[PDB]
RNA sequence: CCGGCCGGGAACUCAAAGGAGACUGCCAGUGAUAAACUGGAGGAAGGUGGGGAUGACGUCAAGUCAUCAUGGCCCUUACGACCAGGGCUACACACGUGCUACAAUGGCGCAUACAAAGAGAAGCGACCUCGCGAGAGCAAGCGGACCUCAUAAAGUGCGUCGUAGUCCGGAUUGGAGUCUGCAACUCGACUCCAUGAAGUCGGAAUCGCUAGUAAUCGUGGAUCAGAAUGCCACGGUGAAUAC
């Protein structure tokens, strides 16, 4: 019927889900090439389905906001890793080894008293 | 810098103003506020402007066209 | 309900709402939209709540 | 460090070529966070030098890493008043990385108008043996070997 | 239709408050649905610490105004003459919408 | 030729062409040729007498050059003449829009010698 | 304590309520135009030291002029003070 | 109505209460058979997963008699109190902490994609009209996932300029205005026109940073009649290097 996954990078959020149908991507109502699919982030939601070789059997309806070219095709990433639980779990174990199962831990740190920003600390005196 | 719509000039010395309109030109007068506008109906007066320690007598002429009266007082000094 | 046209500061009673068999006193009025804020002193503090023109009746 | 041994993050290939080495090259020469406008000039540079030269794009930046690669690293031995540069085998990860400080540190010192021009031509300079990286690898080598006390 | 909207400064004070004004509705007979989260506020404080001098250090403190909406579906005659004035919650400050 | 300006403008952008006149920036640049039908977005390299006639007619409007630096130097020596606060912080080269003497406003004081 | 800028600033409150917040929105209509005439120099006659431009927000228990905060009505080593011992309300410490 | 706008679903983006999960626990090796360590499996995350709060007995007779309290001393038709103006902002100087630059990695112009965290009633101030504009008049919504501040900016497409003291960078100065406020007067902010200094990545020396960090670009808040490059807080992109 449906399989669904919801992923997030840092600031983004998504829900994606699985239809069966054309190799296409909609993204917010919108083609992938068109919105970031000729410019930086081009693959890396195709890393996930690059091992599988899924090219024409699924499509994928995406809904996303928050964060940046960057945060929008890394919570697509998740929620494709979390959605690829439609068919036996035989092709996840070697998807684990990639890389991209694995939420990651890397968030921003917050702003200190005292300091500029996260760790930077002010100019001290030469003498 | 100054009121957008019409020069500001003090009360009080609007009233002194009225006053030489009847007494004519007279001697220097000590007055304490800076904070007026210097206009055609403004040239003539011999008022003394303050300059904390001391008041400066001013004498306003057509050159003084935007310019207020703090803006001729001495307040603090050069070595 | 009977005396439809209200003004500020008057007690009124509530009959649609949870405070039902109380009474209480309209802070403010908003003749345009037709609403009134009207507060209920229960638990000793201002609980407000929106009444119709219509609904209630004037105290 | 002190306590343990740590190696730095480990990095993807590219998006564009699956090449592990062009990301780390692209990563050196980003400046301020802008990885798009770095790896642009990168491609764009490659693609000029690989249409003028008429070689693969593979030998393109390979040939030209070659020659600014070097084959011996400095040791401080503290021989010559608390510092010396005793001559050792380069390790690999230190012979790329030391290839790539250089080629890029060559592209910021050229005086060419656009980092795309510096770029491709300290890239051709390098591969026939005549650049600023050159330079910089045939000096190191030469102060090694005359500082050689010790092997 | 009975839009209540809670106001607490703790946790564990306004579910505890929208459990009884939950249990004294559905109980009797009307029609309700459940609480509906309405986000918490944050508002942070931040003061210099030290009296006479104090260049680069500071204290920060915040307070977190929670919020909550049950929004009764049917005002029923049941649940208009029972739902208040006996939780004692003088630390809840509710709001009505109509 | 002379048209109005301190000297050839030549070789330049039309925009630019008038930006290196005294008394005219990018607004009255635009402003003038704009008002003569003249291309800004190139350079003034073979330009026609004809198009150049009506820029000759068009900047003698306003203020020219020399004659705004006398304008500039009347205004101050008006209030020089006249000894307020504006005349004095003039002649004794002190800023007076409010910039601090105790470390900066070099531009306007001058060059450092303790 | 300092009993002068108390003294001056109770004095100022309800001064500035006696003349101004009245026919203050009257110069604002007539001396700034809004649609010279001689009807300005009649409303420029409000006293200079009521005015609200000179009132200086301070602390309610000791008059102090710096470090107020004008939601909780104190200063910071007031605040300060009330928030270590519990006494304002869910004034927690913030560790995110 | 091609608007989530309306039945419906409340699945779910998001939102927020209660739980579960990571405890050297599972195996092997090592170690002393003890504690413990290394690798692998499971798991979203293994050896306090990441970050913050919380700073021992004590130290500097460290700072605050100026937040307040207080011993002693002093003034008392005066070191007390009110008011106008001035100073706290000066200028042959030295030093600290910061911001902007020296450019084709960028300047100008058009079009366009994606946030988080907050604040808001003498408030935020939509929409409409006037002015190139700063802003004024008219004028909804809401004490707040509704309404506003608020259009996120770097990024990405083309056209322009090609290494110059330049379409780089803006100092200083004049003329003419707007907003707040009795009132811009030495000593304020912003807008328009004109002027386009120094500066070619900086001597001796010195600082910060081990991964979402450094760097870079925006947003909000406290104080605030009206006034921040400072303080506090939030996110976009996102490293280099450890022998």
């Known amino acids: 019927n449906q399989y669904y996954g919801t992923g997030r990078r840092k600031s983004s959020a998504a829900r994606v889900f699985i239809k069966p149908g054309n190799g296409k991507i909609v993204i917010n109502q919108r083609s992938l090439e068109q919105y970031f699919g000729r410019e930086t982030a081009r693959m890396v939601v195709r890393q996930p389905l690059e091992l599988v070789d899924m090219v024409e059997k699924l499509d994928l309806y995406i809904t996303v906001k928050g964060g940046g070219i960057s945060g929008q095709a890394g919570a697509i990433r998740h929620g494709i890793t979390r959605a690829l639980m439609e068919y036996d779990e035989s092709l996840r174990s070697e998807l684990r080894k990639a890389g991209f199962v694995t939420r990651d831990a890397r968030q921003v740190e917050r702003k200190k008293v005292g300091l500029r920003k996260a760790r930077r600390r002010p100019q001290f005196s030469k003498r | ?79 | 309900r009977p005396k439809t046209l209200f003004e500020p500061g008057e007690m009124v009673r509530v009959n649609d709402g949870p405070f039902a068999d109380f009474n209480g006193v309209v802070e403010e009025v908003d003749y345009e939209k037709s609403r009134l804020k009207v507060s209920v002193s229960i638990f000793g503090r201002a609980t407000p709540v929106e009444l119709d023109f219509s609904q209630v009746e004037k105290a | 460090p002190r306590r343990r041994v740590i190696g730095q993050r480990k990095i993807l290939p590219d998006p564009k070529f699956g090449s592990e080495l062009l990301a780390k090259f692209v990563n050196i020469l980003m400046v301020d966070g802008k990885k798009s406008t770095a790896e642009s000039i990168v491609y764009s540079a490659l693609e000029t030098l690989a249409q003028r030269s008429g070689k693969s794009e593979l030998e393109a930046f390979e040939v030209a890493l070659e020659n600014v690669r070097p084959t011996v690293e400095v040791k401080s031995r503290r021989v010559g008043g608390s510092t010396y540069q005793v001559p050792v085998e380069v390790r690999p990860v230190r012979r790329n990385a030391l290839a790539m400080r250089w080629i890029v540190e060559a592209a910021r010192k050229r005086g060419d108008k656009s980092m795309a021009l510096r770029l491709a031509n300290e890239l051709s300079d390098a591969a026939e043996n005549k650049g600023t990286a050159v330079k910089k690898r045939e000096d190191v080598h030469r102060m090694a070997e005359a500082n050689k006390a010790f092997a | 239709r009975i839009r209540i909207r809670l106001k607490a400064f703790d946790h564990r004070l306004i579910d505890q408050a929208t459990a009884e004004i939950v249990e004294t509705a559905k109980r009797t007979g009307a029609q309700v649905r459940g609480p509906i989260p309405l986000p918490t506020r944050k508002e942070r404080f931040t003061v210099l610490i030290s009296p006479h001098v104090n260049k680069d250090a500071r204290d920060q403190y915040e307070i977190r105004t929670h919020l909550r909406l049950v929004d009764i579906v049917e005002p029923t005659e049941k649940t208009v003459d029972a739902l208040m004035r006996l939780d004692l919650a003088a630390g809840v400050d509710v709001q009505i919408s109509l | 030729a002379r048209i109005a300006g301190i000297n050839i403008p030549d070789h330049k952008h039309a925009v630019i062409a008038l930006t290196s006149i005294y008394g005219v920036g990018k607004t009255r640049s635009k402003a003038i040729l704009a008002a003569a039908g003249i291309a800004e977005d190139v350079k003034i390299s073979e330009l026609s007498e004809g198009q150049i006639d009506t820029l000759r007619d068009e900047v003698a409007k306003f203020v020219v050059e020399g004659d705004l630096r006398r304008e500039i130097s009347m205004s101050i020596k008006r209030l020089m003449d006249l000894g307020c606060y504006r005349g004095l912080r003039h002649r004794r080269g002190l800023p007076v829009r409010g910039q601090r003497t105790k470390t900066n406003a070099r531009t306007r004081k001058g060059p450092r010698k303790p | 304590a300092k009993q002068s800028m108390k003294a001056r600033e109770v004095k100022r409150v309800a001064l500035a309520d006696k003349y101004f917040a009245k026919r203050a929105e009257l110069k604002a209509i007539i001396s700034d135009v809004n649609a010279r005439w001689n009807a300005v120099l009649k409303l420029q006659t409000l006293p200079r030291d009521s005015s609200p431009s000179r009132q200086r927000n301070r602390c309610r228990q000791t008059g102090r002029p710096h470090g107020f905060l004008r939601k909780f009505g104190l200063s910071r080593i007031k605040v300060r003070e009330a928030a270590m011992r519990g006494e304002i309300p869910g004034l927690k410490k913030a560790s995110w």
């Open chain 2, 1 to 79: 810098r100054s009121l957008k719509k019409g020069p500001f000039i003090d009360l009080h010395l609007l009233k002194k103003v009225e006053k030489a309109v009847e007494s004519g030109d007279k001697k220097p007068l000590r007055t304490w506020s800076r904070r007026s506008t210097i206009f055609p109906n403004m040239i003539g007066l011999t008022i003394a402007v303050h300059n904390g320690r001391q008041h400066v007598p001013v004498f306003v002429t057509d050159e003084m066209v935007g310019h207020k009266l703090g803006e001729f007082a001495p307040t603090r000094t050069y070595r």
